[PDB]
């Protein structure tokens with residue numbers, strides 16, 4: 029299939045997953061999206077240290093199993109997250125250090141993997157062991173202070189506890205090859221492979237924002253690690269601003285590296301995100317697909333063989349030959365758009381932004397004042413509303429994110445002056461458009 | 465006085481007010497802004513029919529006076545809202561009809577206005593009496609069915625109750641001069657003035673959104689009513705998306721009309737708005753000034769020395785004489801901007817959008833990574849986060865909405881290559897810019 033992320037990803041032998049929060053599984057809107065779109069699941073917090081071993085020697089898998097049960101019940105595989113980490117440690121562990129901490133770490137790994145033995149596709153055995161100071165050294169934590177060999181020990185312990193699981197090292201800010209952190213993790217994984225330390229994969233969290241922006245060299249980073257003899261996976265993907273282009277670039281980088289197993293986005297809806305303020309996911313608050321969703325799906329399906337109209341560009345309806353035109357090149361908010369013979373005039377030059385807007389005049393946005401059929405499509409000052417965002421489906425249609433309705437040439441008209449509206453998508457030619 | 469809205473408006477003998485919610489007067493974050501920025505107050509709900517006369521003949525002014533006193537104590541006048549309206553009527557009035565309802569209306573007016581006699585600057589005597597059906601006729605309500613002369617009666621009663629208060633007719637969707645509703649109200653006020661019906665003002669709610677967009681002819685409307693011999697007031701202003709241009713346009717419309725008494729925005733922070741989802745106010749939920757706030761203040765203070773660049777222009781540093789430049793015309797997210805000899809190149813053409821972004825290349829935005837001093841200012845895909853929105857102060861400084869910090873040429877550098885950072889505003893020449 030090529031209508032859902034999971035199925036689409038499956039076409040390249042890859043998976044596409046998300047992070048599930050057990051407390052949200054009772055929300056039908058949430059489960060409807062999660063069950064339909066993803067074939068891989070990571071427990072957002074339920075399989076972490078504090079959640080699985082609340083008191084020393086006392087393991088608890090109720091929260092984890094709620095996530096796990098839902099995943100397999102809906103045909104999804106599971107990534108275990110996470111066994112050894114400096115963050116979210118229960119209180120009893122935070123007060124530990126030295127050999128006592130080292131053995132507790134080992135005991136924890138054995139306890140959790142044993143419970144899920146043979147049920148987990150991948151395990152993030154160790155998470156965020158490297159520093160962000162910019163030196164590429166080890167993060168200064170209670171775990172690292174027990175000895176530099178703690179990571180190696182964690183992996184050897186894991187392989188023995190469940191030899192069927194892929195053992196991954198997971199971390200963030202290791203996507204840009206030029207960053208010292210990236211090279212530090214590289215050198216470690218390389219040392220591991222050379223000495224026989226058990227490690228099958230490297231997880232790239234991929235938490236992209238203006239602080240740590242995506243960079244095209246992410247592909248070389250993936251290639252480099254792949255070349256060490258380990259699989260790579262994008263494990264916690266989310267992009268501040270949810271740029272359509274950035275989301276597509278990440279998708280293509282993974283599909284460009286044969287060893288990239290798949291892509292997991294850290295959440296379902298922006299409102300579910302640990303950083304909802306960055307509206308970084310593929311679905312918005314009310315559960316509708318965002319422009320980035322379409323871009324990701326299209327990339328997974330191979331995309332197209334016609335370079336997207338970078339900056340400016342007309343939109344012509346295949347069923348009329350007329351171009352999306354703004355009546356007499358007006359810049360008056362509330363002006364309903366129309367169909368008109370194509371010509372080189374700004375009032376016909378539309379830019380599809382990475383945020384999903386169709387801009388004209390540089391600061392006016394294609395706007396819908398309503399969500400029902402017959403809603404007049406117009407121009408209005410750009411402010412980022414969902415009624416100003418659109419998805420350009422590969423089938424040639426342009427759907428409104430908020431409405432879920434398609435741009436429709438009223439009454440299937442085709443003569444100049446034909447007004448544009450929103451209407452239940454119909455493969456009709458009065459709803460298909462071509463970039464130029 | 466010109467660092468706050470009220471004080472700036474006062475320079476032209478006008479006021480800039482807000483709608484106060486009695487329940488928020490206990491929130492210091494709320495009152496800190498409210499007491500500082502406005503010199504006119506309207507009770508958001510405390511002076512309405514159901515709130516002042518819970519039972520016929522039994523008036524309750526506790527909540528109302530609470531707001532009234534807070535206002536006067538903090539140096540603000542008050543607009544009484546509202547005496548006769550089809551909405552928010554107590555249960556007992558909603559069932560009355562004909563004469564009994566007519567007398568109930570008259571009594572209500574005498575009761576409330578009697579209590580506040582001589583204390584109120586303006587009274588919205590009658591609210592929303594016209595239909596949106598396109599006919600330009602009266603709205604069908606129990607009040608209108610008491611007889612078409614109800615509006616006239618309400619005003620005559622009001623004049624008698626308190627001859628010292630300015631009596632206003634208040635409505636929405638009467639801003640666009642071409643609308644039937646508008647002409648419907650225009651004709652009524654003209655008639656009233658000709659027949660001597662006591663009416664001193666017309667309140668334009670000014671609730672703008674894609675459904676009923678702002679139109680430049682709003683000024684024409686204000687001037688037309690003004691010519692009739694009545695004052696005009698912007699009573700409940702809020703703009704969907706809070707466009708800087710629209711907010712500035714409305715402010716200038718009032719400044720262009722001698723009879724325009726002032727402007728009231730319907731709320732303090734976006735989170736206090738009856739339409740919070742449209743983030744239509746001047747302050748963010750965190751209390752920070754939005755791009756539109758500065759646009760209004762600048763308008764109230766007069767504006768810029770020269771007509772601001774309408775999209776596309778250089779930004780030259782006063783101290784250095786050099787322009788804001790994107791190194792090597794790079795389009796890579798995360799590229800920090802610099803100062804460089806000014807020249808006609810796209811990597812120096814910045815467009816200030818209505819939303820407050822500073823765009824370059826069309827879909828790239830001036831972006832701040834963090835919120836502290838030294839934070840790098842760079843370019844990043846446009847998505848509309850507050851770290852991508854800026855206020856153009858009249859002193860030449862450019863402030864980040866989210867950080868509240870100024871664009872600053874590092875170390876006061878003036879040479880080519882000087883990097884741009886965020887830093888506490890200092891009025892230094894390395895923090896001043898000219899739109900050229």
Ligand SMILES: CO[C@H]1[C@H](O)[C@@H](O)[C@@H](O[C@H]2[C@H](O[C@@H]3CO[C@@H](O[C@@H]4CO[C@@H](O)[C@H](O)[C@H]4O)[C@H](O)[C@H]3O)OC[C@@H](O)[C@@H]2O)O[C@@H]1C(=O)O
Nearest residue numbers: 047072073109110116155156198199200233264294301302
């Ligand atoms: C107590 O106040 C805040 C906490 O400061 C804040 O961390 C958060 O804590 C929640 C907890 O949030 C988890 C944190 O982990 C996220 O996933 C990680 C993201 O970074 C990657 O590098 C890691 O690999 C990921 O595992 C996850 O998405 C968040 O949901 O969840 C459990 C809660 O009990 C805890 O309080 O929120 C609290 C707060 O809002 O009160």
Ligand SMILES: CO[C@H]1[C@H](O)[C@@H](O)[C@@H](O[C@H]2[C@H](O[C@@H]3CO[C@@H](O[C@@H]4CO[C@@H](O)[C@H](O)[C@H]4O)[C@H](O)[C@H]3O)OC[C@@H](O)[C@@H]2O)O[C@@H]1C(=O)O
Nearest residue numbers: 483508509545546552591592634635636669700730737738
């Ligand atoms: C489902 O219940 C909802 C109501 O539907 C919703 O209106 C709101 O009602 C509150 C009420 O809200 C007031 C309504 O008036 C607003 O101001 C008017 C806006 O329109 C202009 O034309 C008028 O001139 C203005 O006066 C004001 O901003 C809102 O705060 O306040 C009193 C509450 O008792 C009532 O429930 O919210 C309820 C709800 O959420 O339960």
Ligand SMILES: CO[C@H]1[C@H](O)[C@@H](O)[C@@H](O[C@H]2[C@H](O[C@@H]3CO[C@@H](O[C@@H]4CO[C@@H](O)[C@H](O)[C@H]4O)[C@H](O)[C@H]3O)OC[C@@H](O)[C@@H]2O)O[C@@H]1C(=O)O
Nearest residue numbers: 789790791792793794804805806807808809811812880881
């Ligand atoms: C065809 O003429 C072109 C030039 O080929 C083109 O380079 C440009 O030249 C401008 C000049 O552009 C500056 C050059 O410096 C850039 O910043 C550099 C960033 O990396 C650092 O290592 C360097 O030291 C920095 O200089 C800056 O971003 C560009 O804007 O600016 C001065 C102009 O007089 C010169 O012509 O543009 C011309 C052109 O189109 O006219």
Ligand SMILES: O[C@@H]1[C@@H](O)[C@H](O[C@@H]2CO[C@@H](O[C@@H]3CO[C@@H](O)[C@H](O)[C@H]3O)[C@H](O)[C@H]2O)OC[C@H]1O
Nearest residue numbers: 872873874875876877887888889890891892894
């Ligand atoms: O209250 C205001 C003060 O906070 C403000 O302080 C100035 C802040 O900038 C200082 O100069 C910066 C030093 O660091 C460099 O990197 C920057 O480029 C410089 O601009 C300046 O020395 C402080 O005085 O001054 C104005 C007060 O009203």
Ligand SMILES: O[C@@H]1[C@@H](O)[C@H](O[C@@H]2CO[C@@H](O)[C@H](O)[C@H]2O)OC[C@H]1O
Nearest residue numbers: 160200201235236237238239240241
């Ligand atoms: O908890 C972790 C955060 O502390 C971490 O923060 C990163 C710090 O460096 C910045 O450049 C990054 O943008 C920022 O995300 O991010 C990962 C998260 O798991």
Ligand SMILES: O[C@@H]1[C@@H](O)[C@H](O[C@@H]2CO[C@@H](O)[C@H](O)[C@H]2O)OC[C@H]1O
Nearest residue numbers: 596636637669671673674675676677
């Ligand atoms: O209560 C009033 C609302 O009913 C009114 O609704 C307007 C109806 O026309 C649409 O075009 C507008 O977008 C919509 O806001 O708005 C004013 C409010 O006071």
Ligand SMILES: O[C@@H]1[C@@H](O)[C@H](O)OC[C@H]1O
Nearest residue numbers: 353354355356357368375
């Ligand atoms: O918008 C149309 C314009 O593009 C064309 O040039 O003239 C007719 C107008 O309606």
Ligand SMILES: O[C@@H]1[C@@H](O)[C@H](O)OC[C@H]1O
Nearest residue numbers: 436437438439440454458
């Ligand atoms: O144009 C619309 C057409 O596409 C739809 O199928 O039926 C209603 C028409 O108005």
